[PDB]
Each structure stands twice: as structure tokens, then as C-alpha cells.
């Protein structure tokens, strides 16, 4: 059983945004889904608890009135309607499923709830800036072990994802944290170390992806 | 309102040592306290349920204990893959709300490792765009303290570079650093020698990697 | 006052294997803060607080035997143990109740009963098992859909087991919910179930 998030991206201050936590299997039911967000660098903070059918819902104080849950009864979709968004809402939003139960573990009973299945997380950026896709330049090796990489320059907002050889190459890969430039755009590097002998026998291609701008780029990196 | 507090803020420990961290609640939560692990760039993973119950797929070195307002998570033998931030979470107030703690960062203490320095000239594809990016790579070093110095034609550079350091690796507990020197195409074609000088504890003398613009 | 040696009131009543288990005629109950001899199998005790207030002022307590474990000719009454409930490195279970399993891949409906033939009130306990999935239900009780019907002259309830993917407590992800009624003299409790039934073996003759 897996969970997948959907609906994140860029939004203007005061705008709206829909978030969905789609389960990947049939439900035994009487579970809850919990939204947990995490601002850049900060820790985990609770956002909302929603019964999987939608009968009960509870929100944290910061989002009361602004956040709601809507349903599109034409489909089987439960939405987290974020509205009147502001800068304090820029974070990565995780959804997780937990089983609520009453247990006796002491002198008296209490409610127990453990979030045991989590999603991959979706990024929400609240800014007035415009969406820009990235340029992808190669970091070619110049004539032990050799290093090559890809430079993903000038994009907004976060994030981009870089893989190598469509996930077939993970050993020795280092995708660095993006840095914000004076232009208000992001740029990160992804490098990988490789034996010198492999430069002639193997071809290395990096796969960058920028979901906000619908940008997929495969850059072949050949030795100079 | 229940307030969760965690101690310490961060700790550094060698591989094999025992790590101990504590979690506190502003009021008794019985045993409804869970521990989560969040490795860098990933989602939290439930380790301990109801204060002291291991979950499937979790190493036995993770141990939980506590009751009321005092709770402890313990790692009997720290491993490199355990580098993460650990959060305690309270469910005593479910459904209306649950709250997390501030989290404890667990760092790994290992041997000094000297970096491998690489330098990359700007691509021709980028020079046709107007700018030039010179990237310097410091690969797999420990500890994090490292100084990168750009020298364009032996002249010190300042104000035109940006660094970025990866999180501690899950296998060798090292860091890696990327430094990007950004210039305009007009400024880039003026000079010839572009050098990256690296100083680190594991290096006897500073290491300098360089390239000629016409080489 | 009674001094429970590192056991909860529920763990002592149901007969926790690790709990030692005394002299009656006490004036108050005294339990540990976080007793280690909890409900060895994960779950809850229904109306647990009301039972504690009812046992604070007692005059006599004696563990009688309402149903012998040998009185189960149609079911399996000895294979019911779990790792979460250990005794000398071996899997055990509450001594005062019986976890019934299927015998020869069959599980007929139970309709046993018992009248209180004693001049004092009789406290009896029982429980229901909440399995992990449909496969575990057939492995233990065969019957997919099951129920439990407990009925006294002043009690009538129908319990249905639930199934969910739960976290592990004390090792197992299953749960058990325990109940209790008072059985006044010359009254009978009637049990009807076809699975997931934690039948009683011993009861308690109480007097306040
Ligand atoms: C989608 O349909 C459901 C009904 O299936 C709506 O839910 C409420 O559901 C209860 C079920 O106990 C009904 O008694 C109510 O009459 C329903 N309310 C309404 C207004 O229909 C649910 O509200 C619908 N979704 C939206 C967005 O209205
Ligand atoms: C218990 O109930 C009646 C009450 O008078 C008693 O006489 C009888 O022996 C018992 N009957 C059953 C069915 O247990």
C-alpha cells in the first residue's frame, strides 16, 4: 500500500491550491490521513487530520479558516483546499495514513495514532515570481577516478530532480542543494565519480526534471 | 495544548557508540508517543510506536522507553546509515490535533578524509548564452570545514562565487562541496588561467586545480 | 489496602502469566505507576475505570471456576498463545480466560451458558480478538463473518470483530477487547459466538 501526493507548485500570495492524497489500494477503512508540512530547513509541523471518508476534519490554528476539505463527487477524490495562502505556507507537504485506536498501556486508556505509511512529499511555493524552466549544461571531464556532472541553471521555483542513466547509475552520484542567485533563480550541480576506464566504455546521460515548468531534459555528457 | 521538547539539539558520535536522546511533554500523554526518523531528502519513517514498540523493518538497535512526560529513544550501535533527524510525536490529543517535537540531529564522527578536487570549465553551450560558470568539486571529505579560493589569472576572487555542501553520506559519512564561479562571457574571455585552491584538514598543503581557457 | 506487585488491575484479574498472583478483604487498591505486567496482548478493557471504583471497597474475593478448560470438546482450547505473552521463554496467555481456535479446520457456533449458583455476586470477564486480515481470520476461526452475543438478565450486547492494518505493540498487530458484567445470584449469562471468542475459565465471587 502506497500514498502519492498531487497538486503542489507555485502560487501567488492570497491564491488557492488543491492538494490530493491518493491511496494506491483498496481501503479496509476507519483510517485517517494526516497532512504534515516542513518549511525549508525547519522541522515537521502538523497541518490537518482528515478521516479517509471525509466525515471528520481537524486543522491546525495557523490554517483554520484558510484551509478546508472539498470533494469532487464526480470522481472519488478528496481535496485539501488551501486558500488565502501566504509566505508562511511555503513548505513541503507530506500526507500520511494512520490507524486511530484506544489502547490500555498504563493505569487508564488513551488514543494512539501512528503514521506508518507516508507519501513522497509535494512542494508548495508562495511567491509573486514567475515560473522559469532551467538550462542544462554539461560538466565534462578534462584529461584513477574521473568526475563528470550536469549544471542545472536558472530555474524557479524548487524543486528539480536529477537522475543518471534513468536511475541505472546511483553509486557515486552527488546532487547538491540548490543555491539561490542574485537574479532570484536557482542553480544546482549534480556530479558523479567514475573510473577512468569507464569513460570509453560507457555513455553517461543525466535526466533533469522540473515539474512546475513541465521540463524534461536528457543531457549527454561526453569527454572533451 | 501539548508542547513536545527534545534534547539534545544535535550530537556527534562514532560508529558503534550508543546514542541517547530524550523527549518531554508539557503534560502526561500516557504512552501515546511515537518516534520518527527522517533521512535527508526523504519522508519520515515510523520507528517506535506507543513509546516502546519496535516496528517491522526497523533495526533492533533502535530502542524506545518512557511514560507520562519523559521518553527516551536509544540507538545501541550507531551506524553510518542512521544519519538523520529524529522526531517524537504525541497522539494523546487525537483526533483534534497531534504535535511533533523539535527533532534531534544525529551526526556521525569518523576519521579525517581529504577531498578529491575537480575543476570544470564552462561549456560551449553556455558561452553562446552570455555567461560562464566555472564549477569546483570537493568530493568525499571529512570534516565539513573546507575553504575554496578562486584565482582568475592568479588574482584573488571575491563576491562572484557560491558554495553548496551535501548532507553527510549514508555510507562513508563524508561531505561533498560544489563551488560555482559565475562570470559574464566578456569577463571570462579576458583572462587565461582559472584555478581552484582548496584547503582542508586532511591536506598537508593547499591543493590547486586549474585549467587554461585555451587548452 | 491491596498492594499489587507491579501489575495492573486488569493484568491481575485476567491472570497475566508474568503477574505472580494474595489476601482478600482490602480497603483500597494500590497499583504501580507504569506497571510492566500490562495487558500482555495489545488491546483495551471496556469500562475499566468503572470496575476500579467498584473494587475499591470489597469484603471478600475468591476465584471460582465457571468453565473448565477441559469442557471444550468441540473446539481447540490449548493452541491459543502468543509471543507478546511469554512465560519462561515460551508463548502463553491469560490464565483466567481461554483463547479458542478451530479444531480440524471447523468452527461450530457456541451456545454454552452458566447460572450463578452461589450466594454472592459473581464477576465474569471475556474478550474478543481483532485479527490482522481476512487470511488470519480463516486461519484461526475459518468462518469469515463472525459475532459474539453475551446476554444476562441485565446485559445484552453483540460484538463484531474488526480488521485493519495496525502497528505492532509487544510484537503483534492484533488486538483484543475485554468486557465484564456482574452476575447476581440465580441469574445466568448466555454466550453465543462462532469465532474470535476469548471464553472465560475462572470467575470471581465478590462482595462489597
Ligand atoms: C458528496 O456527496 C456526499 C454524499 O454521499 C455529501 O455528503 C453528505 O453526506 C451525508 C452522508 O451521511 C448526507 O447525509 C448529506 O446529505 C451529504 N451532504 C450533502 C450536502 O450532500 C458531500 O457533501 C458531497 N460533496 C460535496 C462537496 O458537497
Ligand atoms: C439459572 O436461572 C434460573 C433462575 O431461577 C435457575 O433456577 C436455573 O437453575 C438456571 N438456568 C439456566 C438455564 O442456567
- Residue C70 DSSP class: G
In the structure grid, which three cell numbers stand for residue B117, read together? 578536487
Q: Nearest to residue A67, comparing CAs of A23, A35, A108, A107?
A: A35
Residue extents of the structural domains in chain A = 3-126, 135-221
- Interface residue of B70, B94, B185 to substitute, partner A, most A CBs within 10 Å: B94
**DSSP sequence for chain B:** ---EEEE-SEEEEETT--EEEEEEESS--TT-EEEEEE-TTS--EEEEETTTEE-TTS-TTEEEEEETTEEEEEESS--GGG-EEEEEEE-TTTTT--EE---EEEEEE---B--EEEEEPPPHHHHTTTEEEEEEEEEEEBSS-EEEEEEETTEE--SSEEEEEPPPPTTT--EEEEEEEEEEHHHHTT--EEEEEEEETT-SS-EEEEEETT-
Top-tier CATH class for A135-221: mainly beta
Helices (H), chain A: 198-201
Give the number of the ligand closest to the Cα of residue A68.
1
Residue C144 distance to chain B (closest CA, Å): 27
CATH fourth-level superfamily of A3-126: Immunoglobulins (2.60.40.10)
In the structure grid, which three cell numbers stand for residue A19, read together? 492538494
Evaluate whether A3-126 and A135-221 have a shared fold. yes
Q: Nearest to residue B70, comparing CAs of B12, B127, B6, B137?
A: B6
Give chain B's domains with CATH numbers: 4-109 (2.60.40.10), 116-212 (2.60.40.10)
Q: Which residues of B186-215 are buried (b: 16+ CB within 10 A; e: fewer)?
A: eebeeeeebbbbbebeeeeeebebebebee
* C-alpha to C-alpha distance for A140 and A166, rounded to whole angstroms: 19
Give chain C's domains with CATH numbers: 1-208 (3.90.209.20)
- Burial of residue A6, with CB atoms counted within 10 A of its CB: 0-12 exposed, 13-18 middle, 19 or more buried: middle
* C-alpha to C-alpha distance for C26 and C57, rounded to whole angstroms: 7
Q: Nearest to residue C157, comparing CAs of C178, C140, C176, C131?
A: C178
Radius of gyration, alpha carbons of chain A: 22
Report the residue of chain B nearest A101, measured CA to CA: B94
* C-alpha to C-alpha distance for B2 and B104, rounded to whole angstroms: 19
Q: Which technique?
A: X-ray
Residue C131 touches partner A, C-beta closer than 8 Å: no
* C-alpha to C-alpha distance for A189 and C10, rounded to whole angstroms: 61
Cβ-Cβ contacts under 8 Å for A201 (sequence gap 6 or more): none
Ligand 2 pocket, CB under 6 A: C 113, 115, 186, 188
- Interface residue of B53, B68, B72, B91 to substitute, partner C, most C CBs within 10 Å: B53
Cβ–ligand 1 contact at A53 (below 6 Å):
no
Contact A104/C38, CB-based, under 8 Å?
yes
Contact A52, A33 (CB under 8 A): yes
- How many CA atoms are closer than 13 Å to the CA of A176, on its beta-carbon side? 31
Resolution, Å (one decimal): 3.0
**Which atom of ligand 2 has the smallest separation from the CA of C113?**
14
Contact C165/A99, CB-based, under 8 Å?
yes
Amino acid at each position: 500500500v502506497q500514498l502519492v501526493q498531487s497538486g503542489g507548485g507555485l502560487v501567488q500570495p492570497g491564491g488557492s491550491l488543491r492538494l490530493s492524497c491518493e491511496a494506491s489500494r483498496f481501503t479496509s477503512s476507519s483510517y485517517w490521513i494526516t497532512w504534515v508540512r516542513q518549511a525549508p530547513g525547519k522541522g515537521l509541523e502538523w497541518v490537518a487530520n482528515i478521516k479517509q471518508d471525509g466525515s471528520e476534519k481537524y486543522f491546525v490554528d495557523s490554517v483554520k479558516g484558510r484551509f478546508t476539505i472539498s470533494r469532487d463527487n464526480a470522481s472519488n477524490s478528496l481535496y485539501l483546499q488551501m486558500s488565502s495562502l501566504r509566505a508562511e505556507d511555503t513548505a513541503v507537504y507530506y500526507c500520511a495514513r494512520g490507524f486511530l485506536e484506544r489502547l490500555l498501556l498504563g493505569r487508564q486508556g488513551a488514543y494512539y495514532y501512528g503514521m506508518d505509511v507516508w507519501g513522497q512529499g509535494t512542494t508548495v511555493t508562495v511567491s509573486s515570481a514567475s515560473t522559469k524552466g532551467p538550462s542544462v549544461f554539461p560538466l565534462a571531464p578534462s584529461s584513477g577516478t574521473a568526475a563528470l556532472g550536469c549544471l542545472v541553471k536558472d530555474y524557479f521555483p524548487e524543486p528539480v530532480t536529477v537522475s543518471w542513466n534513468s536511475g541505472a547509475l546511483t553509486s557515486g552520484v552527488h546532487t547538491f542543494p540548490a543555491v539561490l542567485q542574485s537574479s532570484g533563480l536557482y542553480s544546482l550541480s549534480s556530479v558523479v565519480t567514475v573510473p577512468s576506464s569507464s569513460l570509453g566504455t560507457q555513455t553517461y546521460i543525466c535526466n533533469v526534471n522540473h515539474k512546475p515548468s513541465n521540463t524534461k531534459v536528457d543531457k549527454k555528457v561526453e569527454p572533451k | 495544548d501539548i508542547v513536545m521538547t527534545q534534547s539534545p539539539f544535535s550530537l556527534s558520535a562514532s560508529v558503534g557508540d550508543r546514542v541517547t536522546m530524550t523527549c518531554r511533554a508539557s503534560q502526561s500523554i500516557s504512552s501515546s508517543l511515537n518516534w520518527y526518523q527522517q533521512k535527508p531528502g526523504k519522508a519520515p519513517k515510523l520507528l517506535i510506536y506507543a513509546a516502546s514498540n519496535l516496528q517491522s523493518g526497523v533495526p533492533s538497535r533502535f530502542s524506545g522507553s518512557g511514560s507520562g512526560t519523559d521518553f527516551t529513544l536509544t540507538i545501541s550501535s550507531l551506524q553510518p546509515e542512521d544519519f538523520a533527524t529524529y522526531y517524537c510525536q504525541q497522539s494523546y490529543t487525537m483526533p483534534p490535533e497531534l504535535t511533533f517535537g523539535g527533532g534531534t540531529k544525529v551526526e556521525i564522527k569518523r576519521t579525517v578524509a581529504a577531498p578529491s578536487v575537480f575543476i570544470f570549465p564552462p561549456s560551449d553551450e553556455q558561452l553562446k548564452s552570455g555567461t560562464a560558470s566555472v564549477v569546483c568539486l570537493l568530493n568525499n571529505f571529512y570534516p565539513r570545514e573546507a575553504k575554496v579560493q578562486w584565482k582568475v589569472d592568479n588574482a584573488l576572487q571575491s563576491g562572484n562565487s557560491q558554495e553548496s555542501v551535501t548532507e553527510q553520506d549514508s555510507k562513508d559519512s563524508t561531505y561533498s562541496l560544489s563551488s560555482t564561479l559565475t562570470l559574464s562571457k566578456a569577463d571570462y574571455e579576458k583572462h587565461k588561467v582559472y584555478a581552484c585552491e582548496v584547503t582542508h584538514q586532511g591536506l598537508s598543503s593547499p591543493v590547486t586545480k586549474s585549467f587554461n581557457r585555451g587548452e | 489496602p491491596l498492594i499489587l506487585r507491579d501489575c495492573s488491575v486488569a493484568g491481575w484479574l485476567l491472570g497475566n502469566p508474568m503477574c505472580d498472583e494474595n489476601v482478600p478483604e482490602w480497603s483500597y487498591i494500590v497499583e504501580k505507576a507504569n506497571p510492566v505486567n500490562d495487558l500482555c496482548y495489545p488491546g483495551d478493557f471496556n469500562d475499566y475505570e468503572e470496575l476500579k471504583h467498584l473494587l475499591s471497597r470489597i469484603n471478600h474475593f475468591e476465584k471460582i471456576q465457571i468453565i473448565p478448560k477441559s469442557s471444550w470438546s468441540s473446539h481447540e482450547a490449548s493452541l491459543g498463545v502468543s509471543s507478546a505473552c511469554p512465560y519462561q521463554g515460551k508463548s502463553s496467555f491469560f490464565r483466567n480466560v481461554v483463547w479458542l481456535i478451530k479444531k480440524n479446520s471447523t468452527y461450530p457456533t457456541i451456545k454454552r451458558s452458566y447460572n450463578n449458583t452461589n450466594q454472592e455476586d459473581l464477576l465474569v470477564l471475556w474478550g474478543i480478538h481483532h485479527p490482522n486480515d481476512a487470511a488470519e481470520q480463516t486461519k484461526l476461526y475459518q468462518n469469515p463473518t463472525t459475532y459474539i452475543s453475551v446476554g444476562t438478565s441485565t446485559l445484552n450486547q453483540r460484538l463484531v470483530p474488526r480488521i485493519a492494518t495496525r502497528s505492532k505493540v509487544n510484537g503483534q498487530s492484533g488486538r483484543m477487547e475485554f468486557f465484564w458484567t456482574i452476575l447476581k445470584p440465580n441469574d445466568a449469562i448466555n454466550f453465543e459466538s462462532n469465532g474470535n471468542f476469548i471464553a472465560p475459565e475462572y470467575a470471581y465471587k465478590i462482595v462489597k
